[PDB]
Every structure is written in structure tokens, then in C-alpha cells.
Write a protein that binds this ligand. Structure first.
Ligand SMILES: O=C(O)[C@H]1O[C@H](O)[C@@H](O)[C@@H](O)[C@H]1O
Length: 308
């Protein structure tokens, strides 16, 4: 029972997925690297398979500085606590993987890290991600006529609903752990997600039709509560940042390399039908005003212009 006050230091982690998903692998890598680097003793207890909830639960736990110490979070699942952070990977921000890489390789997102720590008391310790989010639906959704009034789940950050509303869909902010049933019972027609999570959680079972809208390339901060991070001894803080950086690099090389491979696995297995979206590039035009407006609202117009 008895731990070190800031025998061992115990850091609790959470993942929504099993051991086969890139996020869980990234968190394992993080734990491995802290152990390698820290001339000291630390114990990690990673709770998998969504045993501790989903990201909307995790972010409140980290803000409170209890329950869990570290995890990975989507920017658009953190909007309640830091309204600017969804800019980090909002839909249609990145042109392609090269663009996305040029961002994560810089320190250009620093202002958003700073806001998250100041407003939400959550410390970014590295970046994973690299999945490409596409529409996944019960029936094919392949034209703007199909998309008009298309009922779909979005994450809760305002920008997600605003983007898909601009594309003429009917977005709904439904909990991630309720999506499968909401589709299966016809409440919504689909959602949007990247290959690795679709495969790992078997969302193809209810939504077999994937449309290549390629509307987000994920940026997924590895996060520790500010309360825990700031409590750690100074040498361990520095190790956590180095470990986090390297683990993020590992995770995003991994997920980005596997994304197309996993789409093909699901096609080959007869689990997904993959379709292009007709006149997809018209989406870029339609989405600009919403993007510009959001950046202006949060006072990040200069930061957005840079990224583009
Ligand atoms: O849509 C979600 O809430 C989740 O989708 C995937 O599992 C991940 O990208 C996760 O971070 C979150 O975005």
C-alpha cells in the first residue's frame, strides 16, 4: 500500500484499447524508457481495455490530479478544459503526412501546450498519433447528396460539429463508448475514426462502409496530470519529458505506417468496403470559413496561418 511521498513511486495509466493498439504500445514504450533512463525506482500500472473509462473520463481525472497519472488524449476530447487545444489537429488542418510531420518536428504548438498546462493543469510530455480519420457508416456515404443530413457522431469540441455542419451533415456529440450501439440501433448512421481504432474496437461490425474523406491526421499528446508531474523530483521530471518525446516518436511512426496496412487487412477480411468521396477536394473550400472563425475566436489566427 505504502508509496513514496512527493517502496516505490507508482504511476497509473489508462488506455481504451488492448495490447495490440498503437496507443497502448506507446504507453508501454513510455514506461520502458522511463525505466531505462531513470537512475531510480518507479512502478507503472497501466489499466487497459477501457477499464477506467474513455478519454472524456480521463481528461477530468487528470485535471483533478487523482485516479490516473498519465494517458493519451485527443485534442477534441479536451475542449471543456482547454478551448484552444482542438486547433492542434482540427479537421482539414494538414495537407498530408509530410505537413503533419513538419509540425510535430517543430515547437510551433508550444502556445497550445502552455494553455493546456495553465488552464487545465495537464502537462504534454510527448506526441503520438498519425492515424488518418475517415467517415465510417452503415450505408455508403460517397457524394454530397449522401452527406446532406447524414447523422454522425463527433467528439465534443465545438470545431468538430462546426466542420461537419459546414459539410451539410447532422453531427451529434455522443460518447465514444455509445457509438457502436447508437449505430447498431440506427440513432446515427456513422461516425469518423482512424484505421487502428476501428479495427481494435471492431466498429466495422456495425459500420462496414468507409469513405476516404481523410479529414484528419491525428495529433495525440501523451499527457500527465500537472499535479503529478510537478510533484515528481526534478530529475524524474526531465526523464519523463525525454521518455515522452521518444515514445511519441515511436508511436506516430508506428501508427502512420500501419494505417493503410490495417485498412487493407479489413478489406481482405471482408470487414470493410472502402470508397472514395466524389469531389472530396470541394470540402477544403467549404471548411475554410469555419476554421478561420474558430482560430479568430481563440486569438490563434497567427498560429493557424503559420501551420498552413
Ligand atoms: O473518436 C474518439 O473519441 C477517439 O477515436 C480514437 O479512438 C482515438 O483517436 C481517440 O484518441 C479519440 O479521438
Amino acid at each position: 500500500h505504502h508509496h513514496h511521498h512527493h517502496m516505490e513511486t507508482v504511476l497509473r495509466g489508462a488506455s481504451m484499447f488492448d495490447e495490440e493498439h498503437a496507443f497502448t504500445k506507446t504507453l508501454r514504450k513510455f514506461e520502458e524508457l522511463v525505466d531505462e533512463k531513470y537512475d531510480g525506482d518507479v512502478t507503472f500500472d497501466l489499466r487497459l481495455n477501457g477499464e477506467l473509462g474513455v478519454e472524456s473520463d480521463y481528461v477530468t481525472f487528470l485535471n483533478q490530479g487523482v485516479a490516473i497519472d498519465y494517458t493519451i488524449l485527443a485534442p477534441s476530447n479536451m475542449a471543456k478544459f482547454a478551448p484552444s487545444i482542438p486547433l492542434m489537429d482540427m479537421p482539414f488542418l494538414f495537407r498530408d503526412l509530410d505537413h503533419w510531420n513538419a509540425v510535430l518536428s517543430s515547437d510551433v504548438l508550444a502556445p497550445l501546450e502552455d494553455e493546456l498546462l495553465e488552464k487545465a493543469d495537464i502537462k504534454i510530455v510527448g506526441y503520438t498519433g498519425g492515424g488518418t480519420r475517415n467517415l465510417l457508416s452503415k450505408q455508403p456515404v460517397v457524394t454530397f447528396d449522401d452527406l446532406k443530413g447524414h447523422k454522425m457522431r463527433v467528439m465534443g469540441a465545438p470545431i468538430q460539429a462546426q466542420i461537419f455542419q459546414a459539410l451539410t451533415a447532422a453531427p451529434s456529440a455522443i460518447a465514444y463508448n455509445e457509438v457502436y450501439n447508437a449505430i447498431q440501433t440506427g440513432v446515427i448512421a456513422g461516425f469518423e475514426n482512424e484505421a487502428a481504432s476501428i479495427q481494435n474496437l471492431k466498429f466495422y461490425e456495425v459500420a462496414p462502409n468507409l469513405t476516404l474523406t481523410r479529414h484528419s491526421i491525428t495529433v495525440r499528446p501523451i499527457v500527465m496530470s500537472g499535479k503529478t508531474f510537478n510533484s515528481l523530483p526534478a530529475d524524474l521530471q526531465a526523464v519523463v519529458l525525454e521518455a515522452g518525446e521518444e515514445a511519441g516518436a515511436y508511436g506516430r511512426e508506428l501508427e502512420s505506417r500501419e494505417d493503410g496496412v490495417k485498412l487493407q487487412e479489413m478489406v481482405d477480411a471482408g470487414q470493410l468496403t472502402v470508397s472514395e468521396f466524389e469531389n472530396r477536394d470541394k470540402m477544403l473550400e467549404m471548411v475554410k470559413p469555419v476554421q478561420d472563425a474558430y482560430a479568430a475566436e481563440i486569438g490563434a489566427s497567427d498560429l493557424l496561418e503559420a501551420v498552413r
